[PDB]
Amino acid sequence: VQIVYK
Amino acid sequence: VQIVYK
Amino acid sequence: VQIVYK
Amino acid sequence: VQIVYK
Amino acid sequence: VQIVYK
Amino acid sequence: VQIVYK
Ligand SMILES: O=S(=O)(O)c1cc(S(=O)(=O)O)c2c(/N=N/c3ccccc3)c(O)ccc2c1
Ligand SMILES: O=S(=O)(O)c1cc(S(=O)(=O)O)c2c(/N=N/c3ccccc3)c(O)ccc2c1
Ligand SMILES: O=S(=O)(O)c1cc(S(=O)(=O)O)c2c(/N=N/c3ccccc3)c(O)ccc2c1
Ligand SMILES: O=S(=O)(O)c1cc(S(=O)(=O)O)c2c(/N=N/c3ccccc3)c(O)ccc2c1
Ligand SMILES: [Zn+2]
Ligand SMILES: [Zn+2]
Ligand SMILES: [Zn+2]
Ligand SMILES: [Zn+2]
Ligand SMILES: [Zn+2]
Ligand SMILES: [Zn+2]
Ligand SMILES: [Zn+2]
Ligand SMILES: [Zn+2]
Ligand SMILES: [Zn+2]
Ligand SMILES: [Zn+2]
Ligand SMILES: [Zn+2]
Ligand SMILES: [Zn+2]
């Protein structure tokens, strides 16, 4: 699982 | 699973 | 599963 | 976003 | 974001 | 973010 907030 | 907020 | 918000 | 594997 | 593996 | 492996 990868989660990214930019 | 990959989730990305840009 | 890939989810992308741009 | 909700993802569920059962 | 909620991810669940069961 | 909540991730759960069961
Ligand atoms: O957390 S980071 O900002 O460091 C970050 C951000 C991304 S990314 O913005 O999702 O691009 C990636 C990444 N991207 N993978 C996609 C490929 C195609 C579509 C969408 C995403 C990847 O392959 C490897 C590492 C990454 C690290
Ligand atoms: O999260 S990211 O912004 O880093 C991101 C965004 C996309 S994308 O905007 O969905 O293009 C992709 C991607 N695209 N795959 C499509 C191919 C045809 C139609 C629609 C989408 C891909 O093949 C690999 C990594 C990606 C990483
Ligand atoms: O991760 S859990 O297993 O704990 C899980 C699993 C589900 S569920 O299997 O998607 O049912 C739900 C859920 N369901 N929402 C639907 C309503 C109508 C159709 C499809 C789904 C809900 O409203 C609230 C919490 C949930 C927690
Ligand atoms: O890490 S724990 O195992 O302790 C765990 C596991 C879950 S759960 O399996 O995702 O059910 C939950 C939870 N569930 N939330 C859903 C609601 C509807 C659908 C899917 C999920 C919740 O509302 C609060 C705390 C939880 C703690
Ligand atoms: Zn990046
Ligand atoms: Zn930003
Ligand atoms: Zn990117
Ligand atoms: Zn932005
Ligand atoms: Zn992209
Ligand atoms: Zn935008
Ligand atoms: Zn459930
Ligand atoms: Zn099962
Ligand atoms: Zn549960
Ligand atoms: Zn199981
Ligand atoms: Zn639980
Ligand atoms: Zn188990």
Residue numbers in the entry:
A (entry chain A), B (entry chain A), C (entry chain A), D (entry chain A), E (entry chain A), F (entry chain A): 1 to 6
From the study:
Although amyloid fibers and oligomers of two proteins, tau and amyloid-β, have been identified in association with this disease, the development of diagnostics and therapeutics has proceeded to date in a near vacuum of information about their structures. Here we report the first atomic structures of small molecules bound to amyloid. These are of the dye orange-G, the natural compound curcumin, and the Alzheimer's diagnostic compound DDNP bound to amyloid-like segments of tau and amyloid-β. The amyloid components in our structures are steric zippers formed by stacks of six-residue segments from Alzheimer-related proteins.
The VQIVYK segment of tau was suggested as the minimal interaction motif for fiber formation. We previously determined the crystal structure of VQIVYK in two crystal forms; both show the common steric zipper motif of amyloid fiber-like structures. Co-crystallization of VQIVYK with orange-G resulted in deep orange crystals. Mass spectrometric analyses of the crystals showed relatively high abundance of orange-G (∼1∶10 molar stoichiometry with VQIVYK). Similar to Form-1, the steric zipper shows a tight and dry interface; yet there is a large void between pairs of steric zipper, in contrast to the tightly packed structure of Form-1. Orange-G is situated within this void, binding between lysine side chains facing each other from two parallel pairs of zippers, forming an electrostatic network that also involves zinc cations. Crystallization of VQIVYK alone, under identical conditions to the co-crystallization of the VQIVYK-orange-G mixture, resulted in the formation of colorless fibrous crystals giving poor X-ray diffraction.
